[PDB]
Design a protein around this ligand. Structure first.
Ligand SMILES: *Cc1c(COP(=O)(O)O)cnc(C)c1O
Ligand SMILES: *Cc1c(COP(=O)(O)O)cnc(C)c1O
Ligand SMILES: *Cc1c(COP(=O)(O)O)cnc(C)c1O
Ligand SMILES: *Cc1c(COP(=O)(O)O)cnc(C)c1O
Lengths: 441, 441, 443, 443
RNA sequence: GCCCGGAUGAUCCUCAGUGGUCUGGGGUGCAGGCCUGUAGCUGUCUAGCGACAGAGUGGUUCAAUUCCACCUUUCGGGCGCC
């Protein structure tokens, strides 16, 4: 009976709800998971069910792959409530949220008040935030939104039933940045009462850079306007998390959203809503109708308990290193072809190399390069050609994917995101070169 | 090389996208699943990723438990679009939707036009429907809603940012039913233009019964008002599915929603949106911002391929049998205590036994019985006491859980839902008796 | 809330107290909780672990570690396959328990007087060999093993591998059946002398038309001449007839050990066996004759299985085999008529059946050998086809009329058996595919 | 889209063509695709299946079927553990391949001249026994096995289980080391006569202060007197020193077979071994001496492992063991000084180290025996403690000064070894816990 | 079992024919005076009355029983000499 050392790791978790510093062994992890699962009624031995929702499972494969967690999280009114029918799942939800909160502090935002995991995409998660704000601000019709050419967060505003006010970005050197004048101009033109919130974005593709959060946080605190931050994959960026921390300090940040897959290397499908006003975060929680999947929370729990805060820190560290490596490698490859690495110092995660030497009109070289890269099995390589027209839920974007009507050149994206390895870079550079050379002939 | 017999089962699936009549063996199933998984870029061998979302997975346990399906379903604009980054997942989504459509026909609604799985609860899934309708009907403020005391679908209307018009139910014998007069009275009072849609419910707890769908479908077709059906767990009920089929025939049904767990015995977290106008169903699909989890679609795929349409039919058949068995068993137990089985012929799934012999005021017997049942490990047993006051998102319900301000008596719920076994019933009856006897002393 | 575990613990504590099969099969949840609880008792899985030995339990592949529920150290110590291993308390405990359940099953199955038994991670043939190896030291003058013929290479070679010379006693034709030639056995005990005989090696489960050896008679011959008696019960645990017969032998004569296969009697993967006896002492001797540690895989497999089925589970399987043996039989009768063949009368075989194939010309159309592969390509396994005049050499010994258990059986025949786990669909598929197979030959 | 499979197929086709370890480890996805592809080739997994046999591959527990990747039929046929099984083409193929990878690894590891080898689902001790069993038939007059002493019950008992009488040749003290007494061996060949000797049984991998037997010298003695030579290479595959030594013996003398454990050399669960030789012929003879079918579990485990590690993977492990052996050593030196003990000089052992424990009074404070369990409760496995004057009886033979490999070794000592898979944390944890363990005894 | 094609799967049964709201040959059960009129199914709702759908899955096409793919079944052909 030295299972006391497992008991001890577990007792420590339940007591302080923080990430283990060093990862648990699978043995401890699975032991724990089973102790939880058997607390859910559907797994009770002496159990009869006479309800419509009893966690009955027809496939052994399904039961096993979810570690016998079938009931989901929350009750009918609360995606945060305890349900005597699934005591184990309820406890699971509480812990994983706590672990997440811990990581969010450790990642940069130490003054985060509260947060919760929600089994939706980042897009829908933002929508939930807008749906919640509507009730707090019934006269509001518009969301003010510093442009970013990513369909999910844009659509999120329309799905919620509000009208986006696209605030274009100001070009500074090579970087696209927040037009603080225009924002404050609009809030005045439309009037704060009519503004649902300011919807800013941190993580994004170069040449766009993380919005001027603190400046916006002030505009928001001043005019009493809610500030929601799309931090889709900014948790892995101490620069990004710092911005959030700061804006909340000198100003107002009502909620920030991040994606589970982009920040924690788990399957697509979950997100985190986080804030500094505890009461308001829970209002968003309460806005969710019915129970939700536990699958994303389970993945997060498993990943974090397995990595430990140390494991996570390591990854964050490697990410930075890979960023330099990638940047420096692109500078070199870039030279050999008379292109350059766009000067985007303020973007911690994403880089862009120019493609001015390829002409997209005579022959479709810039487009052609996109396909070649794909067929050569290079994912994430994002070619951005000049002058793309595109409609998204009625609104028409000029020069779409460039984040502004008329950017100087066509370029190509790459990023050091969490999990990336040197091989990723070397193979990229190796294959990008091969593609460029191919386009010459 | 007799793997031709596996190839053949699979080729048959892809070709006609129907449920196998008889279940596949795990061997075939897993073979298939792996062939899909390896079509997703993240699983390619010669793959480098330089994006922010590459399906990177830190836990081997996570990767394995999802059969290496990490990318989710859909793209940024479409939870139904193909993504070259996840060809396998995209194909997975298409097939599982097809299988589902097949089951939905086979279950009663043969004239279903289109449907899709969505990684949300039934509550949020309904919300999505309201969020979509808003754009089609910008002047609309209210949803007309024949009362049902279930927090999730009620909240769903408010989360979507609309105002519920609670239409009370008419008592007929022991049954609570649709007040068709009041509905048409309200549509006239408020005016069709101001009505977002009529929100009816089929599956529910006795003594409420499935709404008069066809009659409502007509009111809706007449006044040009959208009709959305909460069919939460009605797929398992040929009576319920028939109603839907019919309403669509003599009238208008724009979309019906069902829950994945309640109808297919998989973990809580997914739902199905289904309709008869193909174009409109896809409009709801397009309304979803960003990618979504594949976890619910994978469970459904696995379950159905494993059961086959035969397996499913068997379950549906057993459900009916269990219903009689349960009903007849309650009639008997009921007698011995001078209670009775409420006369609710029109409710195919749920039964109710009275509890008039226990007085909830002197001693709290009706409440006490609820706890005793729980501690004795009987789930689904739903005690409904008289006169419960309760607020849900501002609105105050009188006699909550009874579905009407003043129902004749206190009663107790039980249901034959899919998956239930005889043991469930016998243990229930055995333990309910034991509890009642206990309350006497 | 942590009282949900109470129900699980009751099931486990009960197992650890009495070591009997649970009457009703366990639930996967309970089973896996238990397995994990055992595995963390093993030193390799300790959290505060450092290893400086050459055998520490290290596992390179997670896949491997997972699939064996983190049981790595195998079973036993260097000295005893019986001894508890300080390094691996969990595996040790797993092993005590598996042997217990298996003993429990053996009684339930017909041999209620069974003294002791153990699982050994070898095939049946190799497990027999182990018995012989143990007997050698008890009988140093012994060179011969007396063996009523049965055409199956493993049990036959088990004797040669052990270092002895098989003395093949030909069978007696009694009606349709092939039975023990008791007079021939005694003749050989006398000719060679008891002191030169290591043991008599008898077989229970086997193919028709052969039937189980006359254990009672042989048990007495052995008692009288003071010769050990080893019984090959390969797949006889599923037969109350076979088991009761073993029990009878032990009651009236001597039976030193009976061996049976794991995969044939418990529907687990090949590779495991049970050695069982009526003298606790002697059984332990064979156990201690095993050199070093052994795989825990076969034990794990039967533990999981027995725990999942429960006494009732296993019993039910046993009943359904009988029911299927009746069915399969009638079906052969019917098919026989239709084709001018017959179901050879072999009442004394509870498992295997034989159908005639006289109407097939193998010396003309070679219809008998060609029907073999026909049943094969058409996906019928277990269907053994037996020609006349097969010659086969096995380790230097040449058999005449091989596969038939005698030099000249009346006719060519076809085997089919009702083994545990067989479902109605199995017979129906067999009968159908055979009818098609025979029609085909006509053309 | 179905071209994503192309990359996977290249890896597989390459494996099936040359049967060499992939240089770089496979990816789980590829590995599992392959395994499933094999398993569906087995008749038990066929879709159109009916079984009427007594051994059909039926599995009662899904758990069991899953954990074995649906490989149920085991390996071989009744005749050969070498023969392809019509019933189980998949398992057959799995087995050919495993043997191939293992052969590949054995060359890479030092014995480049290796003729053939096979995996056998038995322990090393039992696998040795099998070798002996095979030799018996080649040398019917043989009663004795000549064996340079090494205190380990399994390899010792392997000889008795096989039915022979071990002739224990005491070792020679040379410096700190214990080595082969070549003059003593020859004395016994002469006294007993080559014709009475089944074989000489030598050991490579072992505990300090003993070191690997002088294979070269012994290989020649064997060549001259025409005596077979069986080498116990239990955990020597991880040592290029041991392997090169085996290769040398084969070059200048005779070595009939060398046996090695699976779990000790490949970090898989206990229960498997490899029998290897330089005469393809003789190796096949031992293979055919195995009676019946065998478990596929041990083969599966090494296949998965080797396929996952790749040549490079395994090589790296081999390099890191060396590096750790250096480390562990220096660390013992340092600790020795601090405590007035020393690292016994045993340059000829590449794996095991010994530290003195002279400063401990076992006849006064019993400090030596009590430090044994101390290292144990404090969670240090593999740390063997060796007192003076241990007496032990093993199968009737009584050892004096047991565990030390001689009757009177100068001092009490403590073993620690750098076995494959050992990590720096292992040494550090050991050194720390030992320092604490020794401090403790002072009080 | 895998491969190759001829038919077949459910409008009283069987044969024959054929892209047009099916047309013949024969036979059978019930009704009426050889003639003439009708002749079964299953699934869902229903107390019942009765009503509502489905003739393999889909595809071509103004329209298919009648074409084309596939599936169910049944017949024939070749593969099978552990
Ligand atoms: C289950 C159910 C719902 C939806 O509940 P969710 O938790 O959102 O899946 C809605 N209405 C009724 C009557 C239900 O039973
Ligand atoms: C990934 C991402 C989102 C959210 O996308 P989902 O598919 O909804 O998770 C939003 N904005 C940006 C910039 C993103 O990269
Ligand atoms: C491990 C070992 C053996 C064989 O032991 P088994 O448990 O039977 O595998 C033999 N000799 C030595 C030196 C060993 O270390
Ligand atoms: C199966 C069997 C054996 C043993 O075969 P193994 O493959 O070694 O387990 C012995 N005799 C008979 C009659 C058998 O059926």
């Amino acid at each position: 009976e030295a299972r006391r050392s497992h008991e001890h790791l577990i007792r420590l978790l339940l007591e302080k709800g923080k990430c283990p510093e060093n990862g648990w062994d699978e043995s401890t992890l699975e032991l724990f998971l089973h102790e939880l699962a058997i607390m859910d009624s559907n797994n009770f031995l002496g159990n009869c069910g006479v309800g419509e929702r009893e966690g009955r499972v027809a496939s052994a494969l399904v039961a096993r792959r979810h570690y016998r967690f079938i009931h989901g999280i929350g009750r009918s009114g609360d995606i945060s409530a305890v349900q005597p029918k699934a005591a184990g799942s309820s406890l699971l939800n509480k812990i994983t949220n706590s672990l997440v909160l811990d990581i969010i502090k450790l990642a940069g935002v130490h003054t985060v008040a509260n947060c919760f995991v929600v089994p939706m995409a980042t897009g829908m998660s933002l929508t939930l935030c807008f749906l919640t704000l509507r009730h707090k601000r019934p006269k509001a019709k518009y969301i003010i939104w510093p442009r970013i050419d990513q369909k999910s967060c844009f659509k999120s505003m329309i799905t919620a039933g509000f009208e986006p006010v696209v605030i274009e970005n100001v070009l500074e050197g090579d970087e696209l940045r927040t037009d603080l004048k225009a924002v404050e101009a609009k809030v005045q033109e439309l009037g704060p009462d009519c503004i649902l919130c300011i919807h800013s974005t941190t993580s994004c593709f170069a040449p766009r850079v993380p919005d001027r959060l603190e400046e916006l946080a002030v505009i928001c605190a001043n005019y009493d306007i809610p500030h929601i931050v799309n931090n889709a994959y900014g948790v892995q960026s101490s620069k990004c998390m710092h911005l959030i921390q700061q804006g909340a300090r000198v100003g107002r940040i009502d909620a920030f959203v991040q994606s589970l897959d982009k920040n924690f290397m788990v399957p697509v499908g979950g997100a985190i809503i986080a804030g500094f006003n505890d009461s308001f975060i829970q209002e968003i929680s309460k806005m969710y109708p019915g129970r939700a999947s536990a699958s994303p929370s389970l993945d997060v729990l498993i990943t974090l308990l397995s990595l430990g805060s140390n494991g996570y820190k390591k990854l964050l560290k490697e990410r930075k290193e890979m960023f330099s490596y990638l940047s420096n490698q692109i500078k070199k490859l870039s030279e050999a072809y008379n292109e350059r690495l766009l000067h985007t110092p303020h973007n911690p995660i994403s880089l862009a190399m120019t493609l001015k030497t390829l002409d997209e009109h005579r022959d479709k070289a810039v487009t052609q390069l996109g396909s070649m890269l794909f067929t050569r099995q290079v994912s994430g390589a994002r070619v951005v050609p000049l002058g793309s027209m595109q409609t998204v839920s009625g609104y028409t974007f000029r020069g779409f994917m460039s984040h502004t009507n008329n950017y100087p050149c066509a370029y190509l994206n790459a990023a050091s995101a969490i999990g990336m390895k040197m091989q990723d870079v070397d193979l990229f550079i190796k294959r990008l070169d091969r593609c460029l050379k191919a386009v010459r002939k």
